[PDB]
Design an enzyme around this catalytic site. Structure first.
Site, PDB file in Angstrom:
ATOM      1  N   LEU B  38       0.832  -1.189   0.000  1.00  0.00           N
ATOM      2  CA  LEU B  38       0.000   0.000   0.000  1.00  0.00           C
ATOM      3  C   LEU B  38       0.875   1.250   0.000  1.00  0.00           C
ATOM      4  CD1 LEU B  38      -2.331  -1.447   2.762  1.00  0.00           C
ATOM      5  CD2 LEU B  38      -2.910  -1.285   0.334  1.00  0.00           C
ATOM      6  N   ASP B  39       0.258   2.393  -0.276  1.00  0.00           N
ATOM      7  CA  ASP B  39       0.958   3.672  -0.204  1.00  0.00           C
ATOM      8  C   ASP B  39       0.434   4.512   0.964  1.00  0.00           C
ATOM      9  OD1 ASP B  39      -1.355   5.151  -0.865  1.00  0.00           O
ATOM     10  OD2 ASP B  39      -0.899   5.127  -2.991  1.00  0.00           O
ATOM     11  N   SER B  40       1.019   5.680   1.176  1.00  0.00           N
ATOM     12  CA  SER B  40       0.666   6.478   2.335  1.00  0.00           C
ATOM     13  C   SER B  40      -0.718   7.098   2.193  1.00  0.00           C
ATOM     14  CB  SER B  40       1.718   7.551   2.576  1.00  0.00           C
ATOM     15  OG  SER B  40       1.721   8.437   1.505  1.00  0.00           O
ATOM     16  N   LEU B  41      -1.178   7.334   0.973  1.00  0.00           N
ATOM     17  CA  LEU B  41      -2.574   7.683   0.767  1.00  0.00           C
ATOM     18  C   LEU B  41      -3.459   6.554   1.264  1.00  0.00           C
ATOM     19  CD1 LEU B  41      -2.190   9.151  -2.762  1.00  0.00           C
ATOM     20  CD2 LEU B  41      -3.256  10.413  -0.928  1.00  0.00           C
ATOM     21  N   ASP B  42      -3.111   5.325   0.894  1.00  0.00           N
ATOM     22  CA  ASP B  42      -3.864   4.179   1.378  1.00  0.00           C
ATOM     23  C   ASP B  42      -3.851   4.124   2.896  1.00  0.00           C
ATOM     24  OD1 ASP B  42      -4.496   3.336  -1.197  1.00  0.00           O
ATOM     25  OD2 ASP B  42      -2.626   2.221  -1.382  1.00  0.00           O
TER      26      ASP B  42
END
Ligand SMILES: CCCCCCCCCCCCCCCCCC(=O)OC[C@H](COP(=O)([O-])OCC(O)COP(=O)([O-])OC[C@@H](COC(=O)CCCCCCCCCCCCCCCCC)OC(=O)CCCCCCCCCCCCCCCCC)OC(=O)CCCCCCCCCCCCCCCCC
Ligand SMILES: CCCCCCCCCCCCCCCCCC(=O)OC[C@H](COP(=O)([O-])OCC(O)COP(=O)([O-])OC[C@@H](COC(=O)CCCCCCCCCCCCCCCCC)OC(=O)CCCCCCCCCCCCCCCCC)OC(=O)CCCCCCCCCCCCCCCCC
Ligand SMILES: CCCCCCCCCCCCCCCCCC(=O)OC[C@H](COP(=O)([O-])OCC[N+](C)(C)C)OC(=O)CCCCCCCCCCCCCCCCC
Ligand SMILES: CCCCCCCCCCCCCCCCCC(=O)OC[C@H](COP(=O)(O)OCCN)OC(=O)CCCCCCCCCCCCCCCCC
Ligand SMILES: CCCCCCCCCCCCCCCCCC(=O)OC[C@H](COP(=O)(O)OCCN)OC(=O)CCCCCCCCCCCCCCCCC
Ligand SMILES: CCCCCCCCCCCCO[C@@H]1O[C@H](CO)[C@@H](O[C@H]2O[C@H](CO)[C@@H](O)[C@H](O)[C@H]2O)[C@H](O)[C@H]1O
Ligand SMILES: CCCCCCCCCCCCO[C@@H]1O[C@H](CO)[C@@H](O[C@H]2O[C@H](CO)[C@@H](O)[C@H](O)[C@H]2O)[C@H](O)[C@H]1O
Ligand SMILES: CCCCCCCCCCCCO[C@@H]1O[C@H](CO)[C@@H](O[C@H]2O[C@H](CO)[C@@H](O)[C@H](O)[C@H]2O)[C@H](O)[C@H]1O
Ligand SMILES: CCCCCCCCCCCCO[C@@H]1O[C@H](CO)[C@@H](O[C@H]2O[C@H](CO)[C@@H](O)[C@H](O)[C@H]2O)[C@H](O)[C@H]1O
Ligand SMILES: CCCCCCCCCCCCO[C@@H]1O[C@H](CO)[C@@H](O[C@H]2O[C@H](CO)[C@@H](O)[C@H](O)[C@H]2O)[C@H](O)[C@H]1O
Lengths: 62, 84, 242, 459, 171, 170, 97, 108, 51, 63
Positions: B38-42
């Site tokens: 996942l990414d930091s937006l996620d």
């Protein structure tokens, strides 16, 4: 930065930003959470006017 | 009345309804970045669902540090005074 | 105590005894609005109610001073018997006192702020105790107001702006307790309008009828809030019909 | 008055001849017995005052002030004995002696028939009061507080002496009963303008009049608890009592001479009430509160109406108990945290639930909740000044709002909110402190049942 | 004090919460939340950091124009309806020291266990103060971070007021 | 218990019951319950107390003040005469305050008693109240807190001089 | 200079958990509570309130009412004004001029 | 439409143009501010956590504040003087002429 | 009693004060039964109207 | 706090109850005086101008 040198009687007491205590970060671990002050930090000359029960200067949506 | 197991069950339950996470790879120790991709937006959206699941806000400074389900369980347990 | 001070107010036969009840409900509302006294906003709201009501109290003492100076009395019986025709000053004072107590436009913000108190406080504050006292005071003095067209015009327009402004505020509020509070302000404005058209007994009937369903609405909102773990935003309710 | 003078004097040998550990018990117990007998002064008649002798008399004005004086001595003893516990025995006995000598001068001051006798006693109260502040205050600037208090008084009191001696030469007497019958009108002239000012300025300083008030907050911040109690409750009322008496011989000149003082009072009460909203020292806030309340008394006395005099009498008694109670409440916090800063110790209702109730009751009387005698006195003055001029209701009403605001602000700031985390020495309230608070408020509230005994001669 | 990455992530969360206040209904919110995410994903890989700062500044200008004037607040968050509601019931633990012996006698088990904690506190304090001296540079702390305990039997320095703080629902 | 001439009341006219319904009147049965459960035990306690009172009949009296010379007859500065006149004037002033209070009580009782017909039926009381207040105002108003028989006389003589002048100009 | 350090504040409750706050000696402390409570509340407040409640017609306001009732009765029975404007008889007044 | 700040409504931090241009000098100043805060925090905490301490932790910042604070004068008196004097002259004139109604005025 | 003899001082001061107040009235009897208001004929066993 | 309120209640009632009972017995068994005209040739004592027995005891004893 001191208050301007007049006869007003501020001496060398610092002139701090004219903001309400309501504007401080409510999540930070303040030593005084109800006032949002840390022990030892210089207090605004008008702190008693800027407590959360009195004058608010927070940004308004309008 | 919340329990440590009860909190953990609901944290994973929410994550198992998130399409970007495969429920087979998910464990309590899965890092949202390193293990799940996942990414930091996620990560911000995961924290928001947790806030919605338990009905209280996690301030941004604390939320950015919660990178696996166990750290969320610990954080919720500590703020709710859950010792069992 | 809040109920007792109201019954002193409603049964009072002289302005001094009425003042006791008038101020009593004011301070009981301060104590109950600020029930959760660790909360700064609760303390702030409690003091705000005191502030606005003491501004209206200026009108009350003005009427007391005029009646003593000009009629030598504080008893309702002697005031109605002497029946002064130059009643502009005493009635303007009463109208000011009613404006604070019944949260008419100008001294109105404290009533929605009073939602800081526990829900039972709001139910009793808005139905059978404090807020109708301002209206009740003016109904007590209809023998004087019914002969004063100037006073009727003032109370009429005050109620009209109040009933419309607060109902307009209510259209967008998301807190269930504030929607009901603004409903009370609007209903109070209508009562003030009824006083302004020289219909005191109709205004009194609305106090009685209003008490039943306004207190019920608060108790229903309290039922919802309790079942939703202290949620008060209607945007997080829904689907409760069944 | 010898039945009160002599037993008061005997309190001195009682204290000095007591066993070392009985000085507070004996002085307190026997001063309470004197206070009980003071109720025999209530034998007042509708027409005549109670005239004991050639030296002393008691009317409905002096009687309530006498009872308040003798009630206050045991309360001051109770309030003082804790912070004087480490004092050596002789200096404790000397402290109690000053309080007793203050009572002696005060009860003689309130009952003297002749105005020079009143003057000497009125002046004599300065000595023990000054000694109590400068010797038993805590801080360095108690020395300055003494000089300000001493020289404000004497700046006004010396012209009063000259006027009093001048009046006796012209009239032949200063017996107050004689003055009632031989009084003559004061005509317009510059000489009479200065006679008027000399007769009044000394009492104005005591009240204190707005603009001559800065000695008072200075004095309170430096005084020990007993000093503040007697100062707030009785010593201010010496000026109020003096004005109520000497205005008899100042008509009709008071008609136009009162204006500048009424303006100072009417505006000053708003200024000092507002100042209370921004005070950071709790004792200084209560001191400014007194200035605002006493401004009403000055207006009442100057407009000279039967309603205003009754209100002035009730206000003087009501303020005395209320303000004394507030200093006692403020002092109870101080004896724990050793600071007068109002914002230092917050949320005390969580820690001291019953003392919070006393704070609540003291605040409610301070803002004059009906039917406390605080409101009765204020209402009567407001009634009478409206007839004097209707516009005064605006300043009176505004002052009521501000008074409620600072009274409750005091209560919210110290008792509500969150408690200060690092203050961990807030021990439970002692029995002595609870008794002290209740010995103020209970008689104050009981006076609601029978207000007539505090409404004065015009009743 | 905040990184660029932190400012963008704070804005995204803040923007999503206000969008929910507008949409109210869950199906409507889901739709517009995904559109909002796609606006952030568009400029996710912007490597020109002057351009990236321009994107954020305009985004915050856009947020200020489009924010809800009465956004939803969690009840116990700052500004919510239950915020600080239970502070009046929080009583610090030192208050038990002043309990009368007859009051303490009502809870013999509780007060014996309290004495063990007070003993643990007393015996740990010197090592905590020493650990902080050894680990603090000459100028003093440059940040507020506190360290863990490093040995066995040591407690993390300055733990008492964290560990023994009042319960969120104390009564 | 009191003088009916000082505090008069008109004769009372109560209509008889005239029911136009077969339903029982709840007030009539509550009235009978009140008589049996409240009044009779209350009356029994009172009669016992009055029996104790009759065994110990003792009296008190209304104090009578001889009349003394007025301030008009006092030589200037003669305090012995002035004192007695001043005390007498003060007693009269308190009496006149209670005379006004009696007339105000009459007026207020009439207003309540006459109901929606007070404006017409309380005219006689209104007139008597108007006159006593005017007389009271003439005697005592505007004297100030330091009032005295001397100041009262000074006001009357000022009023008498204004009345003598007005009559002369006529 | 040579000077003593500031003494540490003492808690009366530490040595005497039953302290009333009057004295460090428990026997004296209890005696001092008793005189204050007895002479303060039992005597002055209770008996003093009773004494005030029963004062014999304080300042003649009851006598004045009875006297007013006697005069109103007499004046109305004889067709006299309830109250006259003039406080003093004009015959005893010699006006100037 | 740009935000206009007022005395009672500050500029939001997200709209403040100096929040997005942070140089080495600004970062250095923030670190110096954090260091001052941390040093005071430690000094406070070593006393606040001291198990032997009973009392108040005196704050020199609080003392300086109260000391600094404890350290339009005839115009309103003149204004109010003329308001009341003018009113009472008018009132006195009418009473002497009989043109003021005081029919039932016997309390004062 | 050497333990409690000091507790008679204020009570004795009151009695002495009361006695001296009464003796002072004996010097102010120049108008006893002579005021126009209260003057009367003495009752048969009366020496003075008040003392 | 609870101890103080118990002490306050005890010492108020210590004389309050006896006084409350004393007033009731005086009212019941002695009762109030009855108003009478002054008999011709009779000079009442100054304390005979008051109605309640406690009031005329106060006037007799102290005033
Ligand atoms: C003759 C001599 C007689 C001497 C006098 C005798 C009276 C004293 C008896 C006390 C005996 C000791 C006792 O047991 O009291 C227990 C009593 C209750 O026990 P508690 O629950 O443990 O109280 C501890 C908390 O502080 C309790 O906290 P709290 O907040 O629940 O109670 C305090 C309460 C105070 O409660 C009251 O004062 C009652 C108000 C009813 C009037 O505060 C208020 O509520 C303030 C409300 C004021 C606004 C009222 C509106 C105005 C109405 C005006 C009506 C005027 C008549 C027409 O304790 C107290 O109330 C302490 C205050 C005592 C002062 C009494 C003043 C009464 C006036
Ligand atoms: C705290 C202040 C303390 C100061 C000291 C107290 C001094 C004193 O005792 O004077 C009191 C006064 C004594 O007056 P007194 O001059 O000795 O009476 C002379 C009579 O001739 C004597 O009267 P009597 O001869 O008829 O007395 C006979 C009576 C016994 O009467 C007594 O002596 C009892 C006295 C009470 C004990 C003292 C307290 O025996 C009875 O039959 C009891 C009646 C029930 C029989 C069933 O008695 C009372 O006031 C008792 C309390 C009031 C009666 C109840 C009234 C009910 C409330 C109605 C108004 C409220 C309306 C609803 C609104 C509620 C508020 C929102
Ligand atoms: C809901 C209502 C709640 C209100 C509270 C309860 C109301 C109770 C009222 C009924 C109780 C009966 C009653 O009123 O008692 C009768 C009376 C009032 O009614 P009364 O005036 O008609 O007297 C009754 C007796 N007869 C009929 C003969 C007249 O109570 C009192 O008068 C008490 C007076 C106390 C005032 C004196 C206090 C003593 C202070 C000592 C001095 C030390 C302090 C220094 C003071 C400062 C200097 C002055
Ligand atoms: C006439 C005489 C007027 C006298 C006015 C006295 C002025 C007093 C002003 C307060 C003084 C400071 C005391 C502390 C009050 C305070 O500062 O609190 C601020 C409080 C904020 O409350 P809130 O908006 O709900 O926000 C809380 C959440 N942070 O908000 C408050 O509680 C204070 C708000 C009241 C401000 C005064 C406004 C009164 C209304 C005046 C206009 C109406 C005209 C008169 C009525 C017309 C009748 C038709
Ligand atoms: C120095 C200032 C003195 C003012 C002048 C007073 C004076 O000397 O007036 C003389 C007059 C006596 O004259 P006489 O012959 O007896 O009577 C006929 C009147 N021309 O005297 C009088 O008639 C009245 C004398 C009264 C005594 C005045 C006392 C001093 C007045 C100045 C102080 C007043 C202000 C007080 C300020 C206090 C400051 C805190
Ligand atoms: C001839 C003309 C002069 C007339 C003088 C009349 C009074 C004469 C008094 C002589 C007795 C003096 O008594 C002597 O002083 C004091 C008080 O008395 C006592 O000692 C005192 O110590 C302390 C006070 O400091 C207290 O415990 C208590 O007051 C007492 O015990 C001495 O133990 C005693 O020896
Ligand atoms: C805070 C302090 C407040 C101070 C207030 C000051 C009030 C000032 C009052 C001014 C009036 C003084 O008193 C005034 O004195 C003069 C004395 O010459 C008197 O007048 C007398 O002298 C003048 C000479 O100029 C003659 O014209 C006049 O015939 C004569 O009677 C006035 O009859 C009197 O009105
Ligand atoms: C006219 C009204 C006068 C009212 C005066 C009220 C004053 C009340 C003060 C009470 C204080 C008593 O305090 C203390 O109690 C007892 C009394 O036996 C004595 O205490 C002890 O003294 C000796 C032994 O040492 C014993 O005789 C006594 O039995 C013992 O109790 C103390 O000597 C006394 O100081
Ligand atoms: C509640 C406790 C209060 C304590 C303070 C009061 C203590 C004393 C109270 C009552 C004293 C007895 O009250 C007193 O009784 C008798 C009536 O019998 C009255 O006396 C009068 O009647 C009796 C006959 O009955 C005769 O002596 C005589 O005709 C006359 O003097 C007194 O005028 C009255 O005052
Ligand atoms: C609030 C209460 C305070 C209580 C304080 C207690 C102090 C103690 C005072 C005791 C005073 C007793 O004083 C004494 O009483 C008796 C009562 O019979 C009086 O006795 C006299 O009273 C009057 C006087 O004209 C007459 O009826 C007659 O001459 C005689 O009976 C005496 O004049 C008085 O010398």
């Amino acid at each position: 930065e001191p208050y301007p040198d007049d006869g007003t009687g501020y001496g060398d007491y610092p002139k701090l930003p004219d903001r309400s205590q309501q504007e401080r970060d409510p999540w930070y671990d303040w030593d005084h959470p109800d006032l949002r002050l840390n022990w030892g930090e210089p207090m605004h000359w008008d702190l008693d006017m800027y407590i959360r029960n009195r004058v608010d200067t927070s940004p308004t949506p309008v | 009345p919340l329990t440590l197991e009860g909190i953990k069950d609901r944290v994973l339950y929410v994550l198992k309804l998130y399409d970007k996470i495969d429920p087979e790879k998910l464990s309590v120790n899965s890092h949202f970045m390193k293990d799940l991709g996942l990414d930091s937006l996620d990560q911000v959206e995961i924290i928001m669902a947790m806030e919605d699941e338990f009905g209280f806000e996690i301030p941004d400074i604390d939320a950015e540090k919660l990178m696996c389900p166990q750290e969320i369980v610990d954080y919720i347990a500590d703020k709710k005074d859950v010792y069992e | 105590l809040f109920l007792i001070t109201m019954l002193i107010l409603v049964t009072a036969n002289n302005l001094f005894q009425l003042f006791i009840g008038w101020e009593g409900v004011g301070i009981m509302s301060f104590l109950l609005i600020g029930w959760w006294y660790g909360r700064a906003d609760a303390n702030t709201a409690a003091l705000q109610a005191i502030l606005y009501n003491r501004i209206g109290d200026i009108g009350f003492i003005l009427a007391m001073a005029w009646f003593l100076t000009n009629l030598n009395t504080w008893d309702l019986q002697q005031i109605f018997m002497l029946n002064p025709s130059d009643s502009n000053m005493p009635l303007i004072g009463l109208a000011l006192a009613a404006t604070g107590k019944s949260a008419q436009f100008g001294l109105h913000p404290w009533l929605p702020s009073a939602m800081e108190g526990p829900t039972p406080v709001s139910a009793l504050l808005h139905s059978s105790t404090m807020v109708v006292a301002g209206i009740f005071l003016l109904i007590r003095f209809y023998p004087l107001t019914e002969n004063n067209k100037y006073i009727q015009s003032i109370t009429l327009c005050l109620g009209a702006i109040t009933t419309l402004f607060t109902a307009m505020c209510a259209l967008t509020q998301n807190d269930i307790k504030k929607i009901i509070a603004f409903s009370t302000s609007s209903q109070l404005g209508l009562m003030m309008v009824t006083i302004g058209i020289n219909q005191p007994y109709l205004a009194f009937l609305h106090i009685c009828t209003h008490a039943f369903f306004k207190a019920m609405l608060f108790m229903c909102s309290g039922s919802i809030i309790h079942s939703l773990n202290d949620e008060q935003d209607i945007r997080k309710m829904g689907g409760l019909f069944k | 008055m010898l039945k009160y003078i002599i037993p008061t004097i005997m309190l001195m040998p009682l204290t000095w001849l007591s066993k070392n550990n009985m000085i507070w018990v004996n002085s307190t117990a026997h001063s309470l017995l004197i206070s009980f007998t003071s109720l025999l002064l209530m034998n007042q008649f509708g027409d005549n005052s109670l005239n004991f002798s050639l030296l002393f008399f008691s009317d409905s004005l002096s009687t309530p002030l006498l009872i308040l004086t003798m009630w206050l001595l045991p309360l001051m003893l109770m309030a003082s004995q804790h912070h004087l516990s480490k004092e050596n025995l002789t200096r404790k006995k000397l402290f109690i002696t000053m309080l007793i000598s203050l009572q002696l001068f005060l009860i003689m001051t309130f009952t003297a028939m002749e105005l020079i006798l009143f003057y000497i006693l009125f002046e004599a109260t300065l000595v023990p009061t000054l000694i109590i502040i400068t010797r038993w205050g805590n801080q360095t600037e108690r020395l300055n507080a003494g000089l300000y208090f001493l020289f404000y008084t004497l700046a006004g009191s010396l012209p009063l002496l000259v006027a009093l001696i001048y009046i006796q030469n012209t009239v032949g007497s200063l017996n107050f009963l004689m003055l009632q019958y031989w009084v003559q009108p004061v005509h317009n002239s510059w000489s009479n303008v200065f006679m008027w000012l000399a007769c009044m300025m000394a009492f104005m300083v005591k009240m204190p009049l707005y603009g001559l008030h800065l000695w008072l907050p200075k004095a309170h911040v430096e005084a020990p608890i007993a000093g503040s109690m007697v100062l707030a409750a009785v010593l201010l009322k010496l000026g109020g009592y003096g004005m109520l008496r000497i205005t008899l011989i100042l008509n009709p000149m008071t008609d136009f001479m009162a204006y500048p003082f009424i303006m100072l009072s009417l505006w000053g009460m708003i200024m000092t009430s507002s100042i209370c909203l921004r005070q950071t020292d709790l004792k200084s806030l209560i001191a400014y509160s007194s200035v605002s309340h006493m401004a009403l008394v000055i207006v009442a006395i100057l407009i000279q109406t039967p309603w205003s005099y009754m209100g002035a009498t009730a206000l003087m008694i009501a303020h005395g108990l209320t303000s004394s109670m507030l200093f006692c409440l403020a002092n109870s916090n101080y004896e724990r945290i050793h600071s007068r800063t109002m914002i230092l110790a917050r949320g005390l209702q969580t820690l001291l639930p019953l003392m919070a109730t006393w704070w609540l009751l003291a605040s409610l009387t301070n803002l004059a909740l009906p039917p406390t005698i605080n409101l009765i006195g204020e209402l009567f003055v407001v009634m009478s000044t409206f007839s004097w001029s209707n516009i005064t209701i605006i300043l009176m009403g505004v002052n009521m709002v501000i008074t409620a605001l600072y009274s409750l602000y005091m209560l919210i700031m110290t008792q509500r909110g969150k408690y200060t985390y690092h203050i961990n020495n807030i021990s439970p309230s002692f029995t002595r402190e609870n008794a002290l608070m209740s010995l103020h408020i209970l008689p104050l509230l009981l006076l609601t049942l029978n207000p007539k005994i505090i409404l004065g001669p015009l009743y | 004090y905040l990184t660029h990455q932190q400012k963008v992530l704070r804005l995204y969360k803040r923007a999503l919460r206000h969008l929910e206040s507008w949409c109210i209904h869950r199906d409507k919110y889901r739709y517009f939340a995904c559109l909002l995410r796609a606006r952030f994903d568009e400029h996710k890989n912007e490597k020109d950091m002057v351009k990236a700062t321009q994107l954020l500044r305009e985004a915050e200008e856009e947020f200020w124009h489009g924010q809800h004037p009465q956004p939803y607040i969690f009840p116990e968050s700052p500004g919510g309806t239950s915020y600080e509601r239970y502070e009046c019931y929080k009583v610090p633990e030192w208050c038990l020291d002043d309990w009368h012996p007859s009051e303490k006698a009502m809870y013999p088990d509780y007060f014996a266990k309290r004495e063990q904690w007070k003993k643990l506190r007393r015996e740990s304090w010197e090592r905590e103060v020493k650990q902080l001296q050894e680990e603090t540079p000459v100028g003093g702390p440059r940040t507020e971070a506190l360290p863990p305990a490093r040995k066995q039997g040591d407690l993390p320095p300055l733990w008492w007021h964290i560990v023994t703080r009042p319960r969120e629902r104390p009564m | 218990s009191w003088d009916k001439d000082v505090y008069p009341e008109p004769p009372r006219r109560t209509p008889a019951p005239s029911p136009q319904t077969s339903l029982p009147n709840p007030i009539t049965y509550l009235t009978k319950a009140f008589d049996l459960l409240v009044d009779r035990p209350v009356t029994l306690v009172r009669e016992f107390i009055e029996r104790q009172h009759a065994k110990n009949k003792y009296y008190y009296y209304h104090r009578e003040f001889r009349r003394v010379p007025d301030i008009t007859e006092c030589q200037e500065k003669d305090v012995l005469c002035m004192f007695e006149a001043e005390m007498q004037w003060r007693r009269d002033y308190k009496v006149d305050q209670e005379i006004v209070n009696i007339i105000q009580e009459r007026l207020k009782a009439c207003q309540q008693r006459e109901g929606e017909s007070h404006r017409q039926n309380c005219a006689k009381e209104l007139e008597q109240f108007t006159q006593v207040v005017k007389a009271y105002q003439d005697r005592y108003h505007d004297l100030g807190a330091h009032y005295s028989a001397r100041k009262c006389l000074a006001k009357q003589k000022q009023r008498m001089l204004a009345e003598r002048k007005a009559a002369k100009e006529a | 200079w040579q000077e003593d350090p500031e003494p540490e504040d003492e808690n009366l409750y530490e040595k005497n958990p039953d302290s009333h706050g009057y004295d460090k000696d428990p026997a004296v402390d209890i005696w001092n509570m008793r005189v204050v409570f007895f002479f303060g509340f039992s005597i002055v407040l209770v008996l003093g309130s009773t004494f005030v409640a029963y004062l014999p017609d304080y300042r003649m306001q009851e006598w004045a009412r009875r006297e007013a009732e006697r005069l109103v009765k007499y004046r109305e029975a004889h067709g006299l004004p309830i109250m006259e404007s003039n406080c003093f008889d004009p015959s005893k007044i010699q006006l100037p001029e | 439409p740009k935000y206009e700040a007022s005395r009672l409504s500050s500029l939001p931090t997200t709209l403040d143009p100096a929040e997005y241009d942070i140089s080495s000098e600004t970062r250095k100043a923030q670190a110096e501010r954090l260091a001052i805060r941390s040093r005071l925090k430690r000094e406070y905490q070593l006393q606040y956590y001291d198990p032997s301490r009973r009392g108040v932790i005196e704050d020199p910042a609080l003392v300086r504040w109260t000391y600094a604070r404890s350290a339009f004068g005839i115009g309103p008196l003149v204004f109010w003087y003329y308001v009341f004097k003018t009113d009472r002259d008018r009132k006195e004139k009418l009473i002497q002429e009989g043109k003021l109604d005081r029919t039932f005025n016997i309390s004062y | 009693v050497r333990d409690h003899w000091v507790h008679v001082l204020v009570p004795m001061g009151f009695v002495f004060g009361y006695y001296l107040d009464r003796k002072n009235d004996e010097k102010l009897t120049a108008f006893r039964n002579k005021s126009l208001l209260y003057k009367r004929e003495l009752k048969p066993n009366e020496e003075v109207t008040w003392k | 706090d609870k101890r103080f309120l118990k002490l306050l209640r005890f010492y108020i009632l210590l004389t309050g109850i006896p006084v409350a009972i004393g007033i009731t017995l005086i009212n019941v068994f002695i009762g109030e005086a009855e108003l009478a005209e002054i008999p011709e040739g009779y000079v009442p004592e100054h304390w005979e101008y008051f109605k309640h027995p406690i009031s005329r005891w106060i006037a007799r004893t102290f005033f």
